[PDB]
Swiss-Prot record, chain A:
Part of the core SMN complex that contains SMN1, GEMIN2/SIP1, DDX20/GEMIN3, GEMIN4, GEMIN5, GEMIN6, GEMIN7, GEMIN8 and STRAP/UNRIP. Part of the SMN-Sm complex that contains SMN1, GEMIN2/SIP1, DDX20/GEMIN3, GEMIN4, GEMIN5, GEMIN6, GEMIN7, GEMIN8, STRAP/UNRIP and the Sm proteins SNRPB, SNRPD1, SNRPD2, SNRPD3, SNRPE, SNRPF and SNRPG. Interacts with GEMIN2; the interaction is direct. Interacts with SMN1, SNRPB, SNRPD1, SNRPD2, SNRPD3 and SNRPE; the interaction is direct. Interacts with cytosolic DDX20/GEMIN3 and GEMIN4. Interacts with SNRNP70 and HNRNPU. This is Gem-associated protein 5. It is found in: Nucleus, Nucleoplasm; Nucleus, Gem; Cytoplasm. The SMN complex catalyzes the assembly of small nuclear ribonucleoproteins (snRNPs), the building blocks of the spliceosome, and thereby plays an important role in the splicing of cellular pre-mRNAs. Most spliceosomal snRNPs contain a common set of Sm proteins SNRPB, SNRPD1, SNRPD2, SNRPD3, SNRPE, SNRPF and SNRPG that assemble in a heptameric protein ring on the Sm site of the small nuclear RNA to form the core snRNP (Sm core). Belongs to the WD repeat gemin-5 family. The WD repeat domain mediates binding to U1 snRNA and to U4 snRNA. The WD repeat domain also mediates binding to the 7-methylguanosine cap that is found both on mRNA and snRNA molecules. The regions that bind snRNA molecules and the isolated 7-methylguanosine cap overlap at least partially. Besides, the WD repeat domain mediates interaction with the 60S large ribosomal subunit.
Curated annotation (Swiss-Prot), chain B:
The WD repeat domain mediates binding to U1 snRNA and to U4 snRNA. The WD repeat domain also mediates binding to the 7-methylguanosine cap that is found both on mRNA and snRNA molecules. The regions that bind snRNA molecules and the isolated 7-methylguanosine cap overlap at least partially. Besides, the WD repeat domain mediates interaction with the 60S large ribosomal subunit. This is Gem-associated protein 5. Part of the core SMN complex that contains SMN1, GEMIN2/SIP1, DDX20/GEMIN3, GEMIN4, GEMIN5, GEMIN6, GEMIN7, GEMIN8 and STRAP/UNRIP. Part of the SMN-Sm complex that contains SMN1, GEMIN2/SIP1, DDX20/GEMIN3, GEMIN4, GEMIN5, GEMIN6, GEMIN7, GEMIN8, STRAP/UNRIP and the Sm proteins SNRPB, SNRPD1, SNRPD2, SNRPD3, SNRPE, SNRPF and SNRPG. Interacts with GEMIN2; the interaction is direct. Interacts with SMN1, SNRPB, SNRPD1, SNRPD2, SNRPD3 and SNRPE; the interaction is direct. Interacts with cytosolic DDX20/GEMIN3 and GEMIN4. Interacts with SNRNP70 and HNRNPU. It comes from Homo sapiens (Human). The lineage of its organism: Eukaryota, Metazoa, Chordata, Craniata, Vertebrata. The chain holds residues 1375 to 1496 of 1508 of the full protein. Signal peptide: none annotated. The SMN complex catalyzes the assembly of small nuclear ribonucleoproteins (snRNPs), the building blocks of the spliceosome, and thereby plays an important role in the splicing of cellular pre-mRNAs. Most spliceosomal snRNPs contain a common set of Sm proteins SNRPB, SNRPD1, SNRPD2, SNRPD3, SNRPE, SNRPF and SNRPG that assemble in a heptameric protein ring on the Sm site of the small nuclear RNA to form the core snRNP (Sm core). It comes from the Eukaryota. Belongs to the WD repeat gemin-5 family. It is found in: Nucleus, Nucleoplasm; Nucleus, Gem; Cytoplasm. It is linked to Neurodevelopmental disorder with cerebellar atrophy and motor dysfunction: An autosomal recessive disorder characterized by global developmental delay with predominantly motor abnormalities, axial hypotonia with decreased or absent reflexes, gait ataxia and appendicular spasticity. Affected individuals have cognitive impairment and speech delay. Brain imaging shows cerebellar atrophy.
Length: 166, 84
């Protein structure tokens, strides 16, 4: 409600006004703007869920398709796995003080390689939680029987079942 | 030490009231200790497995370094002894 307030106050309309002038392949600072717009979309998505708990249907739901960013959820997945492995090793050191490794190292060597494969644009500029957004989209779709969200629901399902499975 | 604690707990449970492999473990551990010279036994040393764990933790913070063969040595030492 402060993330929402900033958008509602300093940019009441869409962010596309800031895209044509500079972000339309005019400056190398166009990726960061996307993140801002993405964050905006994220907030709007949550607002729609807050409305559910019809008028803004397929017309508005088609704007969130850019937010999924399959190439961007892998980064969050890798960071989460790396953080959980670091926590596991810290707990191992704590248990050694008070007193699975091969696959753990394979996971690390795949996650670090995947992170290195991404360019600096993805790593440097933030983004909202993609899997949480997919979960909220699925929750909203569950409240609309028979809509099926066309291929958007399929994309959300495959992104949610490919990365971050627990 | 863990086997001695296990036997002490067995005696306590007998007071208030796996052995073949335990004895095999003892007869291998005592033999391994006897095989070492007095230099290793008499003079202390920091916890090697904990040091390997800290090295792995530090390496996890550096992506792509791989520590060359040092990481491999730490991994094999950690997965060969003290596995739990």
């Amino acid at each position: 409600t402060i993330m929402q307030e900033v958008y509602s106050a300093f940019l009441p309309d869409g962010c596309d006004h800031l895209r044509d002038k500079l972000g339309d392949h005019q400056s190398p600072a166009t990726p960061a703007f996307k993140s801002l717009e993405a964050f905006f979309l994220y907030g709007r998505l949550y607002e729609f869920w807050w409305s559910l708990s019809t008028e803004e249907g397929e017309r508005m739901l088609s704007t969130f398709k850019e937010l999924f960013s399959e190439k961007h959820a892998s980064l969050q997945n890798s960071q989460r796995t790396v953080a959980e492995v670091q926590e596991t090793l810290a707990e191992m050191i704590r248990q050694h003080q008070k007193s699975s490794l091969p696959e753990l190292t394979k996971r690390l060597t795949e996650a670090n390689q995947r992170m290195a494969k991404f360019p600096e644009s993805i790593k440097a500029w933030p983004f909202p939680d993609v899997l949480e957004c997919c979960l909220v989209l699925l929750l909203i779709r569950s409240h609309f029987p028979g809509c099926l969200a066309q291929e958007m629901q399929q994309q959300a399902q495959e992104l949610l079942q490919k990365y971050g499975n627990t």
